[PDB]
Design a protein around this ligand. Structure first.
Ligand SMILES: *[C@@H]1O[C@H](CO)[C@@H](O[C@@H]2O[C@H](CO)[C@@H](O)[C@H](O)[C@H]2NC(C)=O)[C@H](O)[C@H]1NC(C)=O
Ligand SMILES: *[C@@H]1O[C@H](CO)[C@@H](O[C@@H]2O[C@H](CO)[C@@H](O)[C@H](O)[C@H]2NC(C)=O)[C@H](O)[C@H]1NC(C)=O
Ligand SMILES: *[C@@H]1O[C@H](CO)[C@@H](O)[C@H](O)[C@H]1NC(C)=O
Ligand SMILES: *[C@@H]1O[C@H](CO)[C@@H](O)[C@H](O)[C@H]1NC(C)=O
Lengths: 48, 232, 144, 48
């Protein structure tokens, strides 16, 4: 699951929403530990 | 092509770091590996680093020196730190065997020209004793120290009311907590911090202190003598 | 706004040893580094010592080099300050304060073929952040 | 670990056991939450 939030840095009115500033947990190289990674996901690749 | 082009040579003070780099092409840099030379006057040739292909390991002759690569870019970065007086020589980057065969001793082919690396060479804060101004005016407080405490580290401000516990007002000279209004402002310049207070009232009568924090050096943390504010 | 309790002060002769105890509640003691501030009556504040959240990084003063000891015990939520080689200049009020960075967890324990269970923290980053926002009543230490 | 339960409804006595509830946790599409699901398993496919 993605605890995503909506990006508002140097944004333009035409590109409202779209990019989303997602944060999710992820297995590290050891298969015993969770990181907390973040990424950018367009609104066409994430659903609610 | 095959020849190697190096860059990053220069003069370094004892106790610093460098970013030696070298790049090459020649449609044949997939069979070779790239390492580095070291030739000081009066001595023979040694080796400093060899980024072995087929293992990705960054072998080096000393702990400080480290070789590195980045993506498919045909550039290799030799990072050196904690330099000392002996590390003044002619650093050349050359090509070693596919699996970093015998180095620190070999003399390879397809070598570069080589750059030049030469190495050679209790603080207490000062504050005014006291300040005074009419109510509603603007007051300025100066905290002057050294380069290590104020110049190289952030400064925090504290207010101690008479017969009361101290309170944080300014942290890293540009932010304030929720409970403190915007009437206080802070700035830094060189090794001196300046605190500006506007709309001074009777309730602001307290003793102000400037301090610095850093774990790197023990001289870095230092609390100011203190400034007394009296409202007429 | 959390409560701060300080105790362990008293009147001692020069060269003696004393222990100062600071208590923590309504907040996570493990999540904040400790500092000690000395202030004589009528003079300015003076930093004394600092310890991180884990206690690995210990930092002291030029006036108290090699004679003050600071430790923390997160299990009992207590701060220990050990005094050695007291001098008549040490008569002052000692203030107990905490940090602000609110250290988080870099890693948590996992279970691959599950990955959904809530498991305790494994690795963490924090400490340092020598800014104090909450100051307790403190303790009075007299040397004579 | 299947938590299995003796089936008993409109059964012809002799066919005791055999069919069974077996309720167990199960990974869903999301790899962070587990759905509690149930199924019917024959006695030949489950061992205590
Ligand atoms: C990553 O794992 C942590 C493990 O704690 C999750 O943190 C918990 O999140 C739930 C809600 O999903 C809260 O109810 C808990 O209080 C949280 N626990 C702690 C210790 O913070 C976190 O939600 C997971 N996901 C992300 C994106 O961090
Ligand atoms: C599915 O997994 C959950 C994991 O919580 C199990 O719930 C636990 O069940 C035990 C059994 O008594 C309780 O002691 C725990 O307190 C329960 N956990 C929680 C968070 O409530 C559940 O039993 C599992 N289901 C099956 C069929 O195995
Ligand atoms: C981000 O902004 C858009 C613009 O309307 C909005 O529709 C969307 O819901 C916002 N995202 C979140 C997580 O609120
Ligand atoms: C449960 O099933 C077992 C078969 O293993 C049977 O022997 C037993 O009588 C059953 N009990 C009930 C209460 O249905």
């Amino acid at each position: 699951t993605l605890q995503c939030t909506n990006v508002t840095n140097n944004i333009t009115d035409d590109m409202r929403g779209e990019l989303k500033n997602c944060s999710f947990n992820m297995t590290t190289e050891l298969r015993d530990k969770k990181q907390k990674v973040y990424s950018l996901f367009y609104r066409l690749d994430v659903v609610q | 092509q095959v020849q190697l082009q190096e860059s990053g040579g220069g003069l370094v003070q004892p106790g610093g770091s460098l970013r030696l780099s070298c790049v090459a092409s020649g449609f044949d840099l997939e069979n070779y590996s790239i390492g580095w030379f070291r030739q000081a006057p009066g001595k023979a040739r040694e080796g400093v680093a060899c980024l072995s292909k087929n293992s990705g390991i960054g072998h080096s002759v000393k702990g400080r020196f480290t070789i590195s690569r980045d993506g498919d870019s045909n550039t290799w970065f030799l990072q050196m730190g904690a330099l000392e007086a002996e590390d003044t020589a002619v650093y050349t980057c050359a090509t070693y065997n596919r699996a970093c065969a015998n180095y620190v001793t070999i003399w390879p082919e397809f070598r570069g020209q080589g750059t030049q690396v030469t190495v050679s060479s209790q603080s207490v804060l000062t504050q005014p004793p006291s300040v005074s101004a009419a109510p509603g005016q603007k007051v300025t407080i100066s905290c002057s120290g050294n380069t290590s405490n104020i110049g190289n580290n952030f400064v925090s401000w504290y207010q101690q009311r008479p017969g009361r516990a101290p309170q944080l007002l300014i942290y890293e000279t540009d932010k304030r907590p929720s409970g403190i209004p915007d009437r206080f402002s802070a700035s830094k310049s060189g090794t001196s911090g300046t605190l500006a207070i506007t709309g001074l009232q009777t309730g602001d009568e307290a003793d102000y202190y400037c301090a610095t924090w850093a774990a790197s050096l023990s001289s870095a943390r230092v609390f100011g003598t203190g400034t007394q504010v009296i409202v007429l | 706004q959390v409560q701060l309790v300080e105790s362990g002060g008293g009147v001692v002769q020069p060269g003696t040893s004393l222990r100062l105890s600071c208590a923590a509640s309504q907040f996570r003691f493990d999540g904040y580094g400790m500092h000690w501030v000395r202030q004589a009556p009528g003079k300015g504040l003076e930093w004394v010592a600092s310890i991180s959240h884990d206690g690995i990084k210990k930092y002291h003063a030029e006036k108290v080099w090699g004679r003050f000891t600071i430790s923390r015990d997160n299990s009992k939520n207590t701060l220990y300050l050990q005094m050695n080689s007291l001098r008549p200049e040490d008569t002052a009020l000692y203030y107990c304060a905490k940090d602000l960075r609110e250290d988080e967890c870099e890693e948590w324990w996992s279970d691959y073929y599950d990955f959904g269970a809530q498991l305790p923290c494994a690795k963490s980053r924090g400490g340092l952040v020598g800014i104090a926002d909450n100051w307790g009543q403190g303790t009075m230490v007299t040397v004579s």
